[PDB]
Structures are given as C-alpha cells and as structure tokens.
Design an enzyme around this catalytic site. Sequence first.
Site, PDB file in Angstrom:
ATOM      1  N   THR A 167       0.855  -1.222   0.000  1.00 21.53           N
ATOM      2  CA  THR A 167       0.000   0.000   0.000  1.00 21.53           C
ATOM      3  C   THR A 167       0.874   1.249   0.000  1.00 21.53           C
ATOM      4  O   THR A 167       1.645   1.484   0.930  1.00 21.53           O
ATOM      5  CB  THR A 167      -0.948   0.044   1.219  1.00 21.53           C
ATOM      6  OG1 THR A 167      -1.744  -1.148   1.256  1.00 21.53           O
ATOM      7  CG2 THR A 167      -1.873   1.266   1.156  1.00 21.53           C
ATOM      8  N   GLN A 168       0.729   2.045  -1.055  1.00 23.00           N
ATOM      9  CA  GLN A 168       1.511   3.254  -1.246  1.00 23.00           C
ATOM     10  C   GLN A 168       0.590   4.462  -1.371  1.00 23.00           C
ATOM     11  O   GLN A 168      -0.624   4.324  -1.531  1.00 23.00           O
ATOM     12  CB  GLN A 168       2.327   3.143  -2.535  1.00 23.00           C
ATOM     13  CG  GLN A 168       3.562   2.266  -2.461  1.00 23.00           C
ATOM     14  CD  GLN A 168       4.488   2.465  -3.659  1.00 23.00           C
ATOM     15  OE1 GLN A 168       4.534   3.544  -4.269  1.00 23.00           O
ATOM     16  NE2 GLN A 168       5.236   1.420  -4.002  1.00 23.00           N
ATOM     17  N   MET A 217       0.277  -6.416  -3.412  1.00 23.93           N
ATOM     18  CA  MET A 217      -0.311  -5.242  -2.750  1.00 23.93           C
ATOM     19  C   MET A 217       0.729  -4.168  -2.435  1.00 23.93           C
ATOM     20  O   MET A 217       0.674  -3.512  -1.392  1.00 23.93           O
ATOM     21  CB  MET A 217      -1.062  -5.661  -1.477  1.00 23.93           C
ATOM     22  CG  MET A 217      -2.273  -6.539  -1.745  1.00 23.93           C
ATOM     23  SD  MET A 217      -3.525  -5.685  -2.721  1.00 23.93           S
ATOM     24  CE  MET A 217      -4.175  -4.538  -1.506  1.00 23.93           C
TER      25      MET A 217
END
Lengths: 231, 240, 195, 244, 233, 222, 218, 235, 204
Positions: free
Chosen positions: E1-2, E107
């Site tokens: 997750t960025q 992810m």
Amino acid sequence: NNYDGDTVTFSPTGRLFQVEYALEAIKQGSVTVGLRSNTHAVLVALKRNADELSSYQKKIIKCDEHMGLSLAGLAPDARVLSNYLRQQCNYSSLVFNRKLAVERAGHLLCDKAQKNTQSYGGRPYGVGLLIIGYDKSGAHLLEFQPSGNVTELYGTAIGARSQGAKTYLERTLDTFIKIDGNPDELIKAGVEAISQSLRDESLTVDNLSIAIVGKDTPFTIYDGEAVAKYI
Amino acid sequence: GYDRALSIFSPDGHIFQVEYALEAVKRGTCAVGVKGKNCVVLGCERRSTLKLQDTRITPSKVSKIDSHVVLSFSGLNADSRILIEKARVEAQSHRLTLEDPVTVEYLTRYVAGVQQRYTQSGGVRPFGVSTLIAGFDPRDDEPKLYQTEPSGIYSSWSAQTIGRNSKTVREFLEKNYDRKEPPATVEECVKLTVRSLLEVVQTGAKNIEITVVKPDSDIVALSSEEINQYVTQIEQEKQE
Amino acid sequence: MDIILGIRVQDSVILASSKAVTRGISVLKDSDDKTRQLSPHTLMSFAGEAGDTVQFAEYIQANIQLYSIREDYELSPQAVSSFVRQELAKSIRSRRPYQVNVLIGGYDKKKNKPELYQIDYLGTKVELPYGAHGYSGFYTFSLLDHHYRPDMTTEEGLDLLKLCVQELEKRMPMDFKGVIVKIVDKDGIRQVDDF
Amino acid sequence: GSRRYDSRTTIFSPEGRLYQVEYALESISHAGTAIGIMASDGIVLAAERKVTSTLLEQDTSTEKLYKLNDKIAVAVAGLTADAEILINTARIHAQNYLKTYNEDIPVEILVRRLSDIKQGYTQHGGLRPFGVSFIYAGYDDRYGYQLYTSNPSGNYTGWKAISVGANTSAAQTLLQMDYKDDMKVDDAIELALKTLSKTTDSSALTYDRLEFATIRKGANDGEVYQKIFKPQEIKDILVKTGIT
Amino acid sequence: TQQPIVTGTSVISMKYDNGVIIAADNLGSYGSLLRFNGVERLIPVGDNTVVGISGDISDMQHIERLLKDLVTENAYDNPLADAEEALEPSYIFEYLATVMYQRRSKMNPLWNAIIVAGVQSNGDQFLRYVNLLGVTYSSPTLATGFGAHMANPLLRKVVDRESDIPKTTVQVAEEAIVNAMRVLYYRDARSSRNFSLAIIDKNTGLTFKKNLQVENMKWDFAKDIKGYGTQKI
Amino acid sequence: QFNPYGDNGGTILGIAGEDFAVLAGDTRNITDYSINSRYEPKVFDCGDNIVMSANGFAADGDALVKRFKNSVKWYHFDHNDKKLSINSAARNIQHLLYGKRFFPYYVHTIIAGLDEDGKGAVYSFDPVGSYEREQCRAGGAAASLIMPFLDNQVNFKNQYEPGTNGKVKKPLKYLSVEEVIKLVRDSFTSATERHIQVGDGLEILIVTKDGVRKEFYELKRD
Amino acid sequence: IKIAHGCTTLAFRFQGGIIVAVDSRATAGNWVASQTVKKVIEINPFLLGTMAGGAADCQFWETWLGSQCRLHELREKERISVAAASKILSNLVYQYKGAGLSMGTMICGYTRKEGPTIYYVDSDGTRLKGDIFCVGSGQTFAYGVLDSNYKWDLSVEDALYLGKRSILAAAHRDAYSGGSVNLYHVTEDGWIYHGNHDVGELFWKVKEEEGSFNNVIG
Amino acid sequence: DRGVSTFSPEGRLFQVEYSLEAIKLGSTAIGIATKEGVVLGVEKRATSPLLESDSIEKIVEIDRHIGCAMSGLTADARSMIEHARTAAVTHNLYYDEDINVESLTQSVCDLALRFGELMSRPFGVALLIAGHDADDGYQLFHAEPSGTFYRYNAKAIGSGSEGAQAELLNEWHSSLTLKEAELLVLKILKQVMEEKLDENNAQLSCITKQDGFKIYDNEKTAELIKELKEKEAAE
Amino acid sequence: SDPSSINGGIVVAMTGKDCVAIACDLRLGSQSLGVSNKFEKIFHYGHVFLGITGLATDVTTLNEMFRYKTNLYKLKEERAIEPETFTQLVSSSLYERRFGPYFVGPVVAGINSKSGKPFIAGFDLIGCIDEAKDFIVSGTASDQLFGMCESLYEPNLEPEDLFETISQALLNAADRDALSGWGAVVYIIKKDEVVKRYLKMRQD
Ligand SMILES: [Mg+2]
Ligand SMILES: [Mg+2]
Ligand SMILES: [Mg+2]
Ligand SMILES: [Mg+2]
C-alpha cells in the site's frame, strides 16, 4: 584411484575423475547424430531396446516449438536437464515474450551442470545432449557434456562408435551445410551419417528416430512408420 | 542435520544395517504368538539371570496399543518403546478422524511402514526390533495375528515366534499346530503357547508371561500361579 | 449450544445438557448430545461457538484416551480438569482461540468423591457443588443456592435438576428442546433415558 | 567432504550390537559403584566417590546423588557432566508435568522420558551417547516406593535392589544373597554399606569417600521425606553399623 | 500500500505510417507545488524503444534502473546484442508488464502509468500501455492521466482506426502531438510548458527532442472578459 | 488505500451448436468513462480446439488466459502430446481460479469447443471456479441484457406451440452456424444501444472439427 | 464481481434408504444467474453431497472428497463409511475456519455397518448426524411439507414425491429458489437418479392433480 | 566408505547396480500384455507353512485402470504405490479423466533417483506396472530403481527372471487371447518356482477395459491351474 | 471487555513491627454474575507470599508458573527464594510478555529469612516494580483500598493490631466495590509462624 571418491576432489594431475566417469556413461549410451544447414537443423538417434519383447528407449525430447535435444547416457538425467530447458524457454516466453536463444540455452545448461561438479554430496550429470534449434540468428546445433562444456557446431555425434559418424560429417561438411530449403535431403545426410556407426545391426522402422526444426518448421519428432521413408 | 546414509546396499545386494538389526532381534528374548478359534495368545520369555527384580513396575513385554489390540516384540527394548508410542498415537488419531478403532492389519501396516522409513532415511539406523501384533477388529470375532520386522515387511500368521531360539519353537509349532483345527478354546490355545515356550525357556516359574486377548476389547494378563498350573500339568503328561 | 448444567451431590455428579442445535431461524436438531466421555469415570459437557465445541471436546477426549492406554491407568478428574484448563489457557492467546465453555463431572476412585469442575473459554477453572455456563446460571444458581444440600442423594439431585429445567423452560426466551441428563458415580457413566 | 571423519555413532555391528552403547557401558564399569535398595517403608541410595583427595571439599560437594524433585532422586554412574545435562532435563520435565496436571509426576513416566532421550542418541543425530547410568529412587501414590535403572542404550528396568558402575557382578551377588522382601529401611541401610565395603577397590571404606541418601515416609503422617546425608551423618551411620 | 509523492502527469503518444511518436512534460509535481522542473520522463532503451512514464517519480527512477540493468544483462554472452538479439520494444514491455502485475498482486504497486513506444525488428510499430494495476492495452493513440481525457480525442481525429495509420505522415502526427501538449498546458493544473518529444521511425531511427516549449498560444481574448456575469468594467 | 481491482467493462457470449461452438466478445476496453482501446481482443485460441475468454478485470483476465495457455503446453509435455478435452480443460481452469479463492481473479470466464463425441460445448465459470456446461451463456457488463434474449431464442423458453392452449412447448432443436451468428450480432448491437461499456467492434471465434475461424463486425463507436 | 451463491436442498432417511432433493436456481443478488445448476455432487457411485452456500466451495471440496474416498478404499480395500467421509470434509473446512468459506451440505450414503446415514456438514465446522435435513434460502418452506408428511414407512415412490413436493413448495414461495427439481434415491448398492423436473411444468401438474395452490389462478 | 551417488569407472551408479542384485533375490513376478487385456502373476513364496499366504500382497491396485506387481525388497514398494495412487487420483481431480499408464509410470520413476546426501538409498524393488488407456491401449511397463522404464509385450522379474524371459520370448505372439495369457503365466511360474505351484503360493490378476483391474480368487486360479495341467498332458 | 475487571477481586499487603500481612477477597465472577466464593488469590512459595488480582485465568497460570520456577530455583540453589529475589523474578517474567501481557496486578509479601526485614512490593501488568515501606494495593477496588490504607495505616503495628487494620481496609473497600467481596482471607506473617484468618463479611 584415491581421488575419485567424490566430485569435490582434484587428482594430482588436476583431473576430476567423477566427471570423467560420468563422461564414460555417455560412451556406453547408444549413438545419436546432430547436423544442420542454414535453414534447418536435424537430430538423428539410434534407439536401444532391452530385448525383442521390450520397446525402444526414446532418445529425443522436445523443449519448445523452436528447440529440442537428443540424449546419450542416463535417461533420467536428460529428463531433469530437458525439463530445466523447457522452464527456461518458457520463462523467456512469459516474461519477455521472447523465444530463448539456442546459445543462451547452452550457457544455462553449462552453469547447471557446473554447480554439480564443485559441491559435496551431489554428483555430475551422467548424460550428453545434442541441442538443435532455430532462433533469430538462424539454425543451430549444440553439444552438451556433463563436465559443463557446451560447444556450438555444424555437425557432431555422441555415444558408442560416434567417431564413425563424426568423421563422415567432417568429410561431408561442405555438402550438407548448403542443403537449404530441403528437409528430406538434410535428413538423408544425417541418416547416412549415423549409418557409419552401425555394427551388425541396421536401421529398422522402430529403431530409427529423427527430429527436425527450421525456418518454417516447428520442432517435430518422427518415429515408427513416419521414418520408413529414410531406410 | 545429520544426513549420513547409514542403511545402504552392498555389492551382493544386501542392506547390512537392516540385516544386523535382525541379529539384534535374534539376541532378544523369545516371543510367541498363537491364535485359536476364538482368541489369540501372546507368550513371552523373560531371562532369569535377573533376580532381585521388581515385577510390579518393570515394563511388561506385552503392550496394549488400544483396548482391542496388543503388541509384543523381540530385540532392543528401548527401540520398541518408540514404535509402541507412535502406534498408540496413530490408534487414537484413527479413532478421531475415521470414528472407528484401527483394524489389526492397519495398525500393523502403520508400524511396519515406520520401520521401513528408518531403512531409507538419512541419519538414522533401522529399528532393532521385530513385533507380533494381535487383536480383534471392531465388531469382528475372527482372530488376527501379524508379524513385522526391521526391513518393514509384514504378514499374517496362524502361529509365529520371534527372538532367540525362535527356530526351535517354530519347529515345534509347525508340527503341533493344525490349520484345519486350531485350538478350539482359550485353555487349549494357552497350553500350546506354554508348551512351545517350554521347549526353549528353562524353568516355568517367573520366566514365562502369557497374555490372552479375546473379542470386544477383552484382554487380560495371567498371573504366576495361573501360568504355573499349565507348567505343572504339561510336565506330568510328558512323563509317559 | 446453550444450556449446560452440573450438580455434584453426595455420591455422584449429574450433568444436564440441552438437546437443541439452532442455526439461523431453524432448529436443525432436537436430540443432540453435548458431551464426551473422557474416561470411564470422567464426563465433559460443552457449549459455545459452532464447530469449535465438538472439535475441542474430541481433541481432549483423544488426549485423555491416549494417556489411559500409555499408563494403563485412569487420570483423576482434578488432573483432567487441569489439563483441559491449560489447553484453553494456551488457546485464548492463539491466532484463533477455542470459544468453548465446559463442565467436567468426574468420580475420583482414590478419594471416593464426586467432583464438578467449571471451566470457561479463557481457561478459568473452579470446583463447585453446582455449576452452569451461559445465561443458564442467571436462573439456576439462585434456585440451587436455596434448595441445594451437600448430602443429597442422586434421586434428590435429579428432582433438584428437574426444578431448574422447569424454571428455564418457563423464563428462557429460546426453546432448547429439553435436556439429556447423565450421572457420573463409582460405577461409571450412565444416561437417564426418561427426562 | 566431511564423510571421511565420521565415526558413525548410531550403527549396528555385524552381531547386532550398538558399538557406542557397548563402549559407553565399558566406560561406566570403571565409575564409582552406586547401590539402590528398596524396602517396604522406604528406599536407600548409597554411592562410592571416585578416589578422593584429602584436600577435596567434602561437605559442599555433589558427585553421585542428585535431587530431581521432592519425591524422586537419582544416583549417577559415569560422566558427571553428561549426567547433569540429563538431570536438568529431568527436573524440567517433572515441573512441566506438575504445571499441566497439578500432580507430582509418577516415577515411571519421568524415567521413561529420560530413557527415551538416551534412546534418541543411539538411533539418530550422529552424536555420541550419554556415558551415564542412573539409579532412580522415588515415590508416588500409585506404586509407592520404586527403584529403576537406565543406561546409555535407553533401556530401563525396575528393581528391588540394584547396583551400577564398578563391580556390579560381585555387588549384585551379595545383594541377591542377603536381601528379603519384608526388609526395613534401617536394615537396607546396613546392607547397602556392607555391600560397598566388600566390593570397594579401596583399602577401607570411610565417610569422606561416600554419598548416602534415604527416601522414607518417616515424616509426620502420610508424606515422604528426602534425606541427603551430611558428612557427619555418614560418619555416624558407619560407626553404628560397625564398619569403622 | 503506497501513496504517490513526487508525481509526473500525462504521457501522450500515437502511431504514424513509418513509426511512433511519444511525448511528456518535464515536471515533477509535489502535490499542488510544481517542485521539480528538469525531470525527464521519456527514457530510451537502445535505439528502437522509448518508455514514457507518469505517476510516482521515485518509482519511475526505479524503473529506469531496471531498464538500464536489462540492457546490461542482455549484452552478457550475447555476440548479437547490437543486432538480431537486441532488445525489442515487445520484450521490454512484457518485462515491465510482468513486474507491474506481480507488484499489484503483492499489494505493493509501482504507482505508475507506462507507455512503451517503439519499432520492432520487422518494421512494425509497437505502442502499448501498462499501469500500477497490471492492466494492459494497445491502440493507435495512447495517453495517460489528463492526456486520456483531452489528448486522445484530438489524436483520434487524425488516426481514428488502423486503416488511418498508413495515411498519417510524421509531419501531421507530430503536429497533433505538439497541439495536444498545448491543450494540456491550458487545462491541466499539474502540467508545465516545457516538454520532451521522441520519434521512433523505422527508417530514420530514434530522434529525441529535448527542451521543447508550448507556443502559439491564444490568450488575447482574456482582456475582453470582465466580471462573472453583470459587471461591465 | 490501494485498490488492486479495476473494471475494464466489455461483454462476452458463448453459444453451442450440434457440431460447432461460438465464443464472441466485443473489442472495447474501458476504465470509468474513458475508452482505452476500440480494438483490444479478449477471446483467444488456446490450442486443442479450445477458445477462451476471461471478461471483467483485464489484468486478471490476461493472467488467467496466459496461465491456461501455459497449462495446455505442459499437458502436452507431461502426457505424450495428448489432446486436452474441453471437459478436462474446464476442470483444470476450476483449479486455477479456486487456487486464488482468497484473492480472486475478478473475471467471468467462458470457454468453448467440441466435446469428445464431436458435439458443441460451452463451459462457464464464476470468479472462484464453480463451473457448468451449458448450451448458452452471456458474461460481462451486458450479460443481464443479452442472457434473457438467449433463453428466449436459443432454448425457446416461454414459447409454446400456437393453438395448443399453452400445453405443448416449442420443441428444442440445434441451430445452424448461420442462425447462431445472427443471434450473436443482434445480441451485441442491442447491448451496444443500451450499455455504454459495450461497442466499437465484435469479434467472433467459431470452432468446428476443421479448426478455429474468426469473423469481425463493426459496432457503434459512441 | 459477486460470485454464484446457489438455494433449497433437502435429504431425509426412510425405510428404503435416503431421498435427496434439490432445486436448480443460482443467483447474484436479484439476478438469476442460472436455472440449470447441479446442486447434487456425485462424490462417487455410493455417496452424494448437496450444494448450498458457496457454489465453488461446495463443488471444489466435495469432488476433492471423492478423491479422498477413493484413496481410502485403495489403501483399506474396503468402502469408506459415511461417518468417515463426512468427517474428512468437516475436518478440512475447520482448518479454513475464519477464512470465509461458505458451505451448507448433506453428505448422504448407505453402507453395511451404518445403514442409510445423513451428515449435515457446515463451513463453521458443524457436523451433525440426523434423519431429516433442509438447507438453503427456501429451507423453512420445505421443512413445513416434510414435517407434516414424513414417516419412516414411506414407500420409495411416495418418499420421492414428498421430496419433490417439498422443493416445489420452496421454489414457489422463496424468490431465490426454483428452476427445476433434481431427485436422487440412495440405496446400499448405490444412488439412483430420478430425473430433472422443471418447476414451471411441475407446478401446474401438481396444482391440478393435488388440488393445492388454490390461491394461484390457473 | 564412499559417496552414495558415486559413479563407477565403467560409468554406472554403484548403489543403483547393487539394488539390482537385491531385486534378483526377490520372488518371481510375470506380466503378459494382450489385445484382450494384460495379465499379472506373482510367486508368493511363504517363508514358513504357518504364514497365512493370503496376507502376502505382491499384486496391488493403483487405479481402476492400472495394476501393479512387485519383486525384491517389497517393503520399499509401499511408498511407491502410495505415490502412484496419489498421482493417479490427483490427475483425475485436476483433469476429470483417467491418467495415461505411461505418465503414471514416469511419475513413479521420478522418485527412483531422488536419493543421495531426498531419501538415503535407491529402492530395492522392481515394479511391473500394467494398465489400459484410450490412446495407447493395453500396456505393460517395467519400472526400475535406476529411474528407467521400458514398455514390454511380456516381462519377468525376480529370481527366475532370465529363465522365464527366455521362455516368454518363444511363447509370446501378437494374437494371444486373455485365457491363453493366463495359462502362460501359470506355466512359466510353475517352471521357475522352487516349491510346487498351487492356488495358495501363486496369485493371478488382470486388467481389462471393461471390468478394470481385478485380483483373481484362489478358487478361480485353482481351476486355471487344473486346466493348465490337463492341456499339457493332452499332447 | 476489559480483562482486568471481568472476574473482579482485590489484594492488599501491609508491613508491621517485625511482620507483614497480606489479604484478599474470595470472589470470582463473570461481570455481574457471581460464580465462586472460594477463589483464593494468595499463594506461597516457601516463605514468600504472592497475591494476584485481575483476569482469573492468568492468576491461575502465573501461580502455576511461579511454582514451576521457584521449584527449579530451590533445586539448583539448594535454598528457598527470598522476597527481594522473587520480586525481581516476577518483574522479569511479566516484562517478557511486554507486548502480550498477563492482565494481572501481583503483590509480593514476606520476611527475608537472613536479615529478618519485612518486605512488600506491587507490580503493574508489564512488571514495573512498586516497592513500599507501608502498604501495597491491587484489584478492582484499588482506589478504595488506597483511600482506606492511607488513612488507617500507621507504622510499626504489632501483628494483632496489624490484622485489624488490614482487615478493616479490605472489608470497607470491598463493600464499595460491586465486583469484590463474597468472603475474605488475611495472612499474618511473622518470622517463623504464619496465621491465616477467614473474615466474616456481607455476602452481597
Ligand atoms: Mg462515447
Ligand atoms: Mg420462487
Ligand atoms: Mg461488594
Ligand atoms: Mg451482590
């Protein structure tokens, strides 16, 4: 003598006896021949049987639509190495949408066989392979030895009495190299080559095994009544 | 981890470590298994060079794997505990997943499989133990008697013996046991088992153990006096 | 899973456990036995999360049965209850805990005394004269406080138990389809078929 | 590779014996003799210290007799360092059992587990076995007073009276001669000392070359007491039986 | 997750008769702040491929390093590295497409939209898109971000389908691209006037144009616009 | 927060005849209200007379097709060039999909070909691997529009024999390849009118014993 | 997208063995995804499983069960018990508990040692032996017909009809059930299929012959 | 000592060559392949008369269309059969079809060379794998611990293998019936067996397309033994 | 769902002249429901006493754990563990579970057998040592106990007087707490004798 217990040991003269004994397993194996022109590459293999009631041991394996090999020696080791080639050919296709170069194929086999000759516990591969293929730089023929040494050639042969076929090809070099756009004539030259390694036995319908790959020809194997044309 | 291949082939095609494990079994105290018409009896030798023993607490030769199956053995005593433990765990695991106790054949097959695994696993030696496994399948009245050995081969026996001087007692059983008519009663089966051990044992005092297994988890071990009565009866009939 | 009760009297332990198995708006079964025999003189009832209950009960059962075979000896109810508590005490700090509450009724043959242990899913053990899990306690405990005597007979215990079930059937919102009653004493475990 | 230097500790001889187990037993046969005698009302443990030096601190010393818990003790014969590894394992196992079941561990269960560990070292791992033989003296409410022994093979057996270490052949004969089933602790004490006194390789048996312990129900009402004898207490019990 | 930090806006591209054109401005935005002005978002691989990247710039620089390393790796034990076994646009794309999808599947995506423009060994035009989701597609005109909404409509008036490609010259195609870049400067709040443009032709090869500016803009009419309805001054 | 899924729109359709089978699908690829490509094929020849489409999220669709195509290749290597039957392919795909049960391929998969008796076969899959053989299946964005029309025109549902008081149903019969393509083309032109994510082009793959043929038709581009 | 969730399934024990009856509808919200779904998995020639909840979960793991049953009888040289077969499935789904599996199933069989046996197995780990079970969105409707008409001494003909009628009852009232009725009859020598019955035709047939559904105009 | 995976100067793996000697000591097993079916027969060889011969399981089912007979250290075969059964069932699960006999044999043979310093030594058992599939029909394979497998029209393995193989060479033809093949296995077994052949110390089996793999009863084999003796005395 | 206040309970410890006192209630409940009136919260390992409040499963677990550790300590050290040393052991053991703690409020009490000095100590759930001359309090009525102890306590109380002070501290604190009470126990600890007294209190 005292330096052949395992592959990790060098002899006083600098030899690896386990690697040489693995090389010896190839000499015992049945003869197989490889040769190419500029348009096609051909494998011819003399299959061997246990007796009259048994089948004939399949010598040729397909690796991709454009690549494959023939074996001589321990067949299970050829299965391991051919399976590895299939994966590497396949990795190149899925990741890079790129047909694997026959030269890189050789480099990968060399490096896989090498690791087995430098570490304790393992053993060298006990099989020799003749890899043919057609890639972006035309037709190719490779000779793999389980020492790790891979060699690109116009023609060659490995197995028992392979020196006869190898001498023939060395004489016929100038003739067969220019058999371009003619599959059946290139096979004939390969069938005549392997015939120089025969003793007492002759090429029968369920004995001979031929494979071919080229410009507009996928890697396909011929056995049974399909090779009756060339006897 | 220790990896060494200890069990390996020799030029003549033998696995010496497995064969030397059999020699350990041959050294072990004699054990005999005889199955009758409605029962199985497991006889066991106990060497009498050991006096001042405490028979209450000393590990018994015959071990219960479940309430309906028993296991006796010949060979290394320490090794046998490992096989018995595994077998007991598998017996409970089988009840848990299949909702039914193990068959005598299944339990034998498991124990034999363990013994085999130790003949081609790195870093381990084979079990210096042969077993006699006996009992009755769930809701079944047909007697079962199986034998295993270090190599891992197992098979069913009408009657069988293992351990030291087992070839003598096997000779006895081979002529005295009738396939067409096995011991009809419990008494007949126990007597034949005691008789067979008396060919080898020495004295019939605290040297012979007898365990009788009957259908529906009915297992009991005989006491000294009870066994001694068979010994006294056999000797009087012998003098003829 | 809902109603499990337990009453220790003079010479026995009595466990009463509801027969209903409800899933959603449907009573799927009305003859469910929410108990396992851990050993000849030890019985465990159970109630809690679906699946977990039976899976836990049978796991304990297997372990105790394994012990029995190995040592050719029956563990005391106190010993079994401690083993059970520890398993739940491990469980509560696991990735997915067993959400199971149990009652362990046993007859100690060495002491010649009945013993009732109540253990919740956290691993909270207590020895009691009478016990219950879930909402059952909220009705029964006060009723037992009043009517219970320590020197009661098994027959007096069953009448006392009938009084509890009647009260539950009157004031409980859910239909639990009666109870299966079991008695644990010196002679082992037996079921009361007409209750 | 390293195969060249492997002794192969866990293999069979052609005769079906475990080389290392047999050689470990040969080691133990040179160790100081240890005797265990079980009476109806208690157990005696007697052991001979290995050739003592006069400047050895005797009172604050422990070589032969170790405590596993309040109800169980062991007498050692072999390598002391090896024994202590096993003793700490046994002590931990006893506490695990107590933690799990809220009951003191039954003697046999402790003995079996310790014997199973020794067995492991003979069947796998490629390590040398523990050069140790134990005499376990303990009590529980199932079997009462119990004597066991285990050796490097991992095989254990129960006894009424038993010796391990040096001169066990001579020692076992003397015990077999004078032992009887209705024997008391005080009688067993005398037998233990008399046996060591005759089997010893020393000139004369003295207090400084002995370790002694009893497990009686001599405490107040239905409870077991462990007594590890002090130097002065051994000196007194040696005079009382008429050895010195 | 960025979450993307330093970002690059639209990359636009199209096919023409002999090859492909691709363009992208030289801006590295930090949210609303137009932080960095000397950022090159077109990265050539060999003399036959240009990879245009929008989105997170730290991830762009990672992809630069991967492509740089890909050229090195291809040269190893490869006598025909500058000939038959040279890197093709299709090889370079498929490699990136594999990476993008593997990263989204873990992810932990590379927060980018990538367009690989080039010419194959047989003379065929190559133009294909891939993004952080591992989604791929090809079209005669491809654009990212605002380019998708504003450039594509303009570029599709020139090359609406496959059959319009042989009819479109490099002069006409470049004109449409430069015009599109001007429109994006009018209407994209995270765009700059300065940009780079690349042409990969099957005959003339790779032409990389730096330091281009948007010009011939219409702003004069602004003087006549007063108030927001009723105001007259 | 990062959302690993997306909707690429489009719609697909599979119909099975007596000795043939068709698998159609529009060539439009979209995200939100933008067109990405007017011609991005999503119906693939996978070899062994199996055609396949995995409509929905294209990245997952392309990954799945790629993996199945690869599965067909390795089936040949491991089993002496044996032909992968449509039923075997279906079961294999179930394991591919269910393999990612807890992080699914967001796709409605359809495959088509001929069964081992030479008869037309269409198999349809949900995103996690549940599958079923059918004569008829529409999948994707406009599946809800097309499917009831197929029930009516292919399987003759709700159609009774005239004058029989609604007692005798219209008898089931196989359709000709000509009649099926007519239904496909009408199904897609209708879907294009009423669904914004459907249009641009229609690509049909027809599977007979002779091989795999293709047909292409324009669709409205608005 | 949403994934398939085809439901009404029942199975009851009686004198002649077991009856299994299921509907055929599968839905994704209000959308009817399929009217022709096979909700009875033929694990092997002697065992049957029913499909409710997750279509994939039930299909995948009940064919997997058929593989485990085949391996059992190869090793044990004997038919697997219904108890054992059901427990292999319930133990498996219990390993996956919490992960989100969705299964409501009846494992039905007829062996020598057990006789006719039905096990309800659940994705939250529940395993129940019983005589009558009913699972799905329309289960309550099917229970009403079953409970009022069930006897142990039903004939194979009457039992088959009762199962068919109970599904019909659910297919009518429950919006998410319908399509067609699949009947099975389990004996000791294996299960016997008793055909597919379209609800559209079955409803009018039953209405006339039985006199039921007077609320509906026909 | 020396490495497990060591080559001899002649170019052979010592441990593989030694395992072949162990297989020669094993009891005889014979397989014959016909167009009507494949027959598998074995010598039970009970070490003592007290041993219940029916518990000797040297013929084994892998799947309904594949059977297996063994010879040598038969305990080593258990894990090979377990793998074969799993491979067979697993393929059916993945591909909703029967698995080819050759592919099954290949999967088994992959285990063979997975030994070294994986398991500690090669298998000390040879297998005769018989079966049927739609593509290649009735097939008989001989799977060695070298990792090699040959297809055979007929094959004998075990102690009396070289004598029995020479007999099979003369007797086998491409038009053999199933009944003819059954008798031929019994005939050749009786020749090489030490003890006298009967229904208790020898076992027959076959695999046909219609009925699948079947182990024959002692009653059925006894009649075939009686039929065999009569036919030899008849000329 | 607050682990420290599900079961309920209290412990209090005080010092006196050449003596210490530790006391606890007997309640174990499940929130509002009272379940057991026999649940003692004070344990001892040799002459070292440990009281534990909080989540009951942990109270039980830790007792079994410190019994385990003090038994091995005694076997190796050949002497009984002292209060000061035990205090450190409790702290070590709790902090080992820093990010997954036992939900408890332990209280050590005892007299050092060598020096003869009275010793008490308290801990938070992650093992922070709270040493005190006067008194230590713990449980769901800690606030109440703090208030009682701070007003009632005076230094150098004789064992008989100390009993009255600690008992009144516990009782009146417990009666202002719903989750505490249902009986009480008081340990009076002198150098080589220990008296245990059950108190009569209101049973609501
Ligand atoms: Mg539009
Ligand atoms: Mg409805
Ligand atoms: Mg209060
Ligand atoms: Mg109150």
